[PDB]
């Protein structure tokens, strides 16, 4: 019993020393030559009304025009962000929904929550109604996130400490990703859809392999729960937002902790994070009714997006045209 | 909207908005309740009396032409600090305690203390149910003492304002006073506790109705500077 612990401690110390060997210089020293981008103003352009209760999640579309949002009253609404028209309105079986996703091909949507189920809806039918096509059961804890790989594969994050990979055609899991300690909160796919990251309440983030299904890397440095995780456009970095009013940037090849985005006048935790198209600007939502914009290369605050209640979700379009933010006051605002 | 197809799209959106208005009008006249408890507590049979790893349940009952929705949390693991934020807008919380064990009551007290002092549960009042009274009545006279579990039981006497075998009442009101001292340790007059002596009964719905009416009346009185 005491022999395995000693070996584990020795391995951890060796890994820490090895990582520290390649520390070299810092990012701030290198980047300080670049002049700052300056100050950014974004004006609200549209406001979307129609949700009864507070808004929990939203997702854009690849066509850069449509989006889907979920609400506590148990309603899914598909919007037309140009003319503010409503295309569909779907009622749910269970009203406690925590996440939603929109298919890359625009053929399906998914949602789930405290019912331990992920549901798939078919938007393209010969009849003029949207119906549910497949229910994915097998998880123990509540569902917290989900993302589409293609029309037949989806990855889910649950509160029972484990992730999973599903086959929608048959409805049975094909891989299970165990190894975390607490319940998992979010995940982020990669542009090539070969790897994905994940964050949990044990203040640790892991890197997974979809093909062969075991953990490849582990990152630490946060002090409290992990609420939202993003992933750099290049594919070799990712960003995290936690409950201790701090944001972190980690690299995959180097395996150290990069520059830190924090300010002494913020006490509340972060709810969502998202990057820009070129990765120059990182913007995150907070609990103090605001949404801050950070310079991703210099940890400088530049811009504020000032809602009535807590901001629960963000989103950036594929072509970088606009940013949409939801909140607990049931209003969606499209900024530019 | 300069094209005919855009006009048809706008008309479809307007019909969707009409349906949403109907849904809002239906939604604004309902009260949501959250039910919490333990395994030994009779919170499972309370639902049946009022009337596949699912993660949540739902029960509907009506009294005096008023709609009530009760949500029972199902297959979720030990700790609850994450999904408790979704219930910070319900009317009240129902708590069920099995007061017939003398051993796990400390765990129930700790759970009640954790729930009452939560940050996200401020301004929500709790309705406290004390279940399985006949078991307590059959167990007190056997003599299963309480002084060993609680050293302060020796210096306790039945309160004068109590309105009930005197020792059965002594035990009942000792447990009730423990729960109420936990409740009164804080609160600042923003949420209250409504204890009850529930048995295997049929008037639980009426008690919930009265407690909810009192809570809403107090909230409205506080809003208008009348209290």
């Amino acid at each position, epitope marked *: 019993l005491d022999q395995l612990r000693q070996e584990a401690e020795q391995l951890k110390n060796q890994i820490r020393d090895a990582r520290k060997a390649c520390a070299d210089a810092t990012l701030s020293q290198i980047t300080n030559n670049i002049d700052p981008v300056g100050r950014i103003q974004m004006r609200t352009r549209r406001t979307l009304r129609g949700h009864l209760a507070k808004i929990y999640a939203m997702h854009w579309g690849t066509d850069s025009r449509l989006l889907v949002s979920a609400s506590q009253d148990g309603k899914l609404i598909i919007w037309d962000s140009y003319t503010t028209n409503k295309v569909h309105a779907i009622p749910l079986r269970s009203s406690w929904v925590m996440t939603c996703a929109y298919a890359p091909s625009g053929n399906y949507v998914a949602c789930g929550g405290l019912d331990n189920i992920c549901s798939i809806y078919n938007l393209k039918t010969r009849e003029g109604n949207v119906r549910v096509s497949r229910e994915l059961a097998g998880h123990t804890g509540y569902l917290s996130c989900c993302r589409f790989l293609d029309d037949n594969q989806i990855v889910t994050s649950s509160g029972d400490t484990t992730c999973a990979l599903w086959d929608i055609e048959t409805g049975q899991q094909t891989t299970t990703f165990t190894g975390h300690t607490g319940d998992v909160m979010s995940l982020s796919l990669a542009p090539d859809t070969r790897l994905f990251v994940s964050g949990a309440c044990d203040a640790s983030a892991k890197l997974w392999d979809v093909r062969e299904g075991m953990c490849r890397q582990t990152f630490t440095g946060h002090e409290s729960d992990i609420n939202a995780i993003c992933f750099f456009p290049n594919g070799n970095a990712f960003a995290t937002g936690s409950d201790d009013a701090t944001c972190r940037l980690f690299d995959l090849r180097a395996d150290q902790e990069l520059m830190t985005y924090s300010h002494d006048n913020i006490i509340c935790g972060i709810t969502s994070v998202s990057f820009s198209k070129s990765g120059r600007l990182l913007l995150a939502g907070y609990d103090d009714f605001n949404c801050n914009v950070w310079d991703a290369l210099k940890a400088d605050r530049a811009g504020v997006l000032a809602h009535d209640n807590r901001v629960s979700c963000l989103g950036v379009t594929d072509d970088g045209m606009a940013v949409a933010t939801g909140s607990w006051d049931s209003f969606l605002k499209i900024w530019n | 909207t300069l094209s*005919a*197809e855009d006009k*048809a*799209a706008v008309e479809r959106s307007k019909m969707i908005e009409k349906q949403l208005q109907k849904d809002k009008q239906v939604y604004r006249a309902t009260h949501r309740l959250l039910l919490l408890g333990a395994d030994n507590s009779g919170k499972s049979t309370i639902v049946k009396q009022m009337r596949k790893t699912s993660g949540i349940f739902e029960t509907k009952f009506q009294v005096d032409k008023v709609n009530f929705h009760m949500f029972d949390v199902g297959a979720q693991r030990d700790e609850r600090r994450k999904w408790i934020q979704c219930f910070n807008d319900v009317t009240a919380i129902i708590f069920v305690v099995d007061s017939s064990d003398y051993n796990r009551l400390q765990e129930a007290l700790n759970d009640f203390k954790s729930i009452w002092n939560n940050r996200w549960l401020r301004t929500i009042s709790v309705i406290l149910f004390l279940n399985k009274q006949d078991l307590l009545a059959e167990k007190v006279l056997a003599g299963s003492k309480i002084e060993d579990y609680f050293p302060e039981f020796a210096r306790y006497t039945t309160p004068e304002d109590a309105t009930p075998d005197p020792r059965v009442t002594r035990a009942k009101y000792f447990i009730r006073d423990e729960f109420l001292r936990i409740s009164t340790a804080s609160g600042d007059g923003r949420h209250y506790c409504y204890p009850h002596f529930t048995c295997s009964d049929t008037e639980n719905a009426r008690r919930i109705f009265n407690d909810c009416r009192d809570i809403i009346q107090r909230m409205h009185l506080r809003q208008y500077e009348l209290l």
Partner: single-chain antibody
Amino acid sequence: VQLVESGGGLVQPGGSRKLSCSASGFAFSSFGMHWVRQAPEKGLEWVAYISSGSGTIYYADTVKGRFTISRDDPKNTLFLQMTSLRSEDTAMYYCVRSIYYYGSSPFDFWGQGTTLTVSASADIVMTQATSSVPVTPGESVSISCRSSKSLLHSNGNTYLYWFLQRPGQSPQLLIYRMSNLASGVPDRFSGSGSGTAFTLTISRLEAEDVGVYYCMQHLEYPLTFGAGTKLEL
């Protein structure tokens, strides 16, 4: 998904007759409805239109005071009321679905139709340059259409449709908005144009492509069809 029309017959001049279209198999309460007429030896023609919520109704300038449309959502039935039948209303009538939102495909399903025999300006005109062409089973084919006004809109859409009914069957839909392919049609058809001149191309050819091809506009009411272009093999 199927629609059945009932009624028809022989009517003395000046009489009245009521037509019924019965829909069963889809969410009928969410589709607009049209009536389209085909003369015994001429092209197609539009008659009336009623929206999903009955909040908008349009009529043809040819017939405005004598015809009446009505829908009954609980029974899933569509009605047409005709009074004082002239000598021109001696054709076959069709029942057509239509749904309008961002990205939909209107005019997708057509009914079977019923026959009716009667004893004895500011709109856009669409002209088909050729009335018949000879083709070969395996070569490339091209059909052209002409318009009197630019169909391109400010938003960016060009409202042109191709139907290509077969000799003995109801019309179907090939291309909507001049570029987008239909659902169940083979992917060997294509469409292109510039706003006033349009063309339809077929790469291969098979024995099922024989029929008449039509050209319709949807920029503003009334809806004006073409003349037709028969292909003989």
